Amino acid sequence: SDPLLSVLMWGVNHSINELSHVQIPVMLMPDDFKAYSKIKVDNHLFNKENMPSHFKFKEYCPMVFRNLRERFGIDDQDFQNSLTRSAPLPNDARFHTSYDKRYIIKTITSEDVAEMHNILKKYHQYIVECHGITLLPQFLGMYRLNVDGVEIYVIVTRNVFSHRLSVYRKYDLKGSTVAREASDKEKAKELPTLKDNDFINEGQKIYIDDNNKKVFLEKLKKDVEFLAQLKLMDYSLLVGIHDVERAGEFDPNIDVYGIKCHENSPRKEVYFMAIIDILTHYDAKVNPEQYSKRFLDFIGHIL
Amino acid sequence: SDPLLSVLMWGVNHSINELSHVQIPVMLMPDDFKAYSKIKVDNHLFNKENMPSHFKFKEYCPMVFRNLRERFGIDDQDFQNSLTRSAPLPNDARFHTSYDKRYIIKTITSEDVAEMHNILKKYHQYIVECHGITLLPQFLGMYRLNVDGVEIYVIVTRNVFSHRLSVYRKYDLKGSTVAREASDKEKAKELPTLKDNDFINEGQKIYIDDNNKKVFLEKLKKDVEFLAQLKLMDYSLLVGIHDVERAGEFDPNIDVYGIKCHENSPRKEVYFMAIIDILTHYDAKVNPEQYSKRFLDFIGHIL
């Protein structure tokens, strides 16, 4: 097994257990956005079967993230179970998904962590204002893991895709001026990741009613403008299509990004659409304000 | 509340939780007697209501002590509950007792801890040999607590007295040549601690049948000789009398040191008798081999 994974599981278990003893108030204080809990474990000639002997686990702003979970309709006991009852599964930036497919666990940089801290309060207030109804990533936990030498940072989000319904096609859309296209090595996977021109070449249509579309684009408008005002760019719309005829009703309380196709759709389809990859990443590298309108226009045209 | 007490409770809770994930083998390995687990917690602007912000908890030889609990008929979940569901109560060396009166928690020195480590394996093997039937202290856990500056060591033992039945009179007997007597300041308490000459002056009798006496003294003989061979001295026989007429059947599976009075006893009495205070303590200060026979003779005469 992966020792970083077992520290993550141990840590989330420890985190949620600790919070079960902490009183939940309705409001956050400015200090909650600067808070953390740190635990350092040293086992000498003990418990080698389960845990590395020397590890650290640090949770950033535990009260804020608990408040976010609640606002996103997520119970702490359930969150704990999803992350701990069985190991998260790998995919290959690399990521894991909880065994029940409800949550995504992504390894991030210390720079991403700094950026998340920078936006956390404004992010929180935005979620308050929209009552948790948003196409933004739903940030549920943020941690630092140390296992004798190696140090990693992780963030946990709600899965954009369904926890039951399988996805047969997936798009990552930015709407950029610079040409975007998938590679053939990716094509060879069971579920590849297609891009802008794949969509605007294979004549992909999304069959949703005018009401669903209006609601979606209203939501997208606000989300994107919030991202713009934080000077964030290079995020994508993730789009996943579930084909009912191959594998089809979903729970909107769990698969919160799902939209049914309208009645005249050529095939029985369910769409899963959300914004992803919102943090900067100074390892990769035209302005944020331009990026947003450009992103908003493209999604307008394709839908 | 007492922050050292809440670290103890947190630590025992954490300890038992961790062990619930560790496989129980039938046997201990030599390394289990050198093992420990260390956890250091640092909370910044978080969880001030329950815990100090900076503390450490260290458990010595967790596998050995788990094995001892099992051998003493104690379930880990029950032990955990007894120590954590409500705070232990103070008494004033000073000690606490678990809320349900099942366990004693005593603060000890780093010297006592060194001595316990020194005897732990031999102690364990002795308990194996007698199948847990002994008048020795039943050692159940040993810990180190740190709360920002202060460092303390604690050991947990089974209560010599009953967890239901009240005790109206208590003796601490060593059988020493040097005169031993209680003080008047102690007398003024609801339940004082009387000594050798109080017994051998107030004409105290213990009314148990010849079978119970023989069994007791056989047990005492072996226990004391084991203590002698470890070069330990200055331990006492603790004696507590429960008066049924004032407050009377006990569970021998819980109140393991209880002995009913015989049928011709002037009053309905239950006795609780065990050895206590077996470690050296180099702060207090004629040889161990002499001490034992001298202790064994006195208990022979008074019973």
Ligand SMILES: CC[C@@H]1C(=O)N(C)c2cnc(Nc3ccc(C(=O)N[C@H]4CC[C@@H](N5CCN(CC6CC6)CC5)CC4)cc3OC)nc2N1C(C)C
């Ligand atoms: C965290 C950052 C960001 C973000 O901000 N949010 C909010 C977010 C939210 N949700 C997701 N979900 C997924 C994104 C992408 C995929 C995918 O294409 N995965 C492929 C690779 C592995 C492939 N494997 C799976 C097991 N298969 C074995 C089968 C036989 C049993 C064999 C084939 C399946 C297809 C799947 C997702 O769900 C599992 N991603 C997010 N991102 C992503 C950029 C990582």
Ligand SMILES: CC[C@@H]1C(=O)N(C)c2cnc(Nc3ccc(C(=O)N[C@H]4CC[C@@H](N5CCN(CC6CC6)CC5)CC4)cc3OC)nc2N1C(C)C
């Ligand atoms: C750990 C070291 C060693 C050892 O090795 N083993 C194995 C061991 C095992 N068991 C005990 N038990 C007790 C020893 C002694 C006493 C006592 O005289 N206590 C007095 C002081 C407090 C008094 N308070 C109680 C609350 N009261 C309030 C009432 C109104 C509600 C008011 C009066 C009650 C009488 C009580 C014990 O049980 C609670 N002691 C041990 N020792 C002792 C030397 C500490």
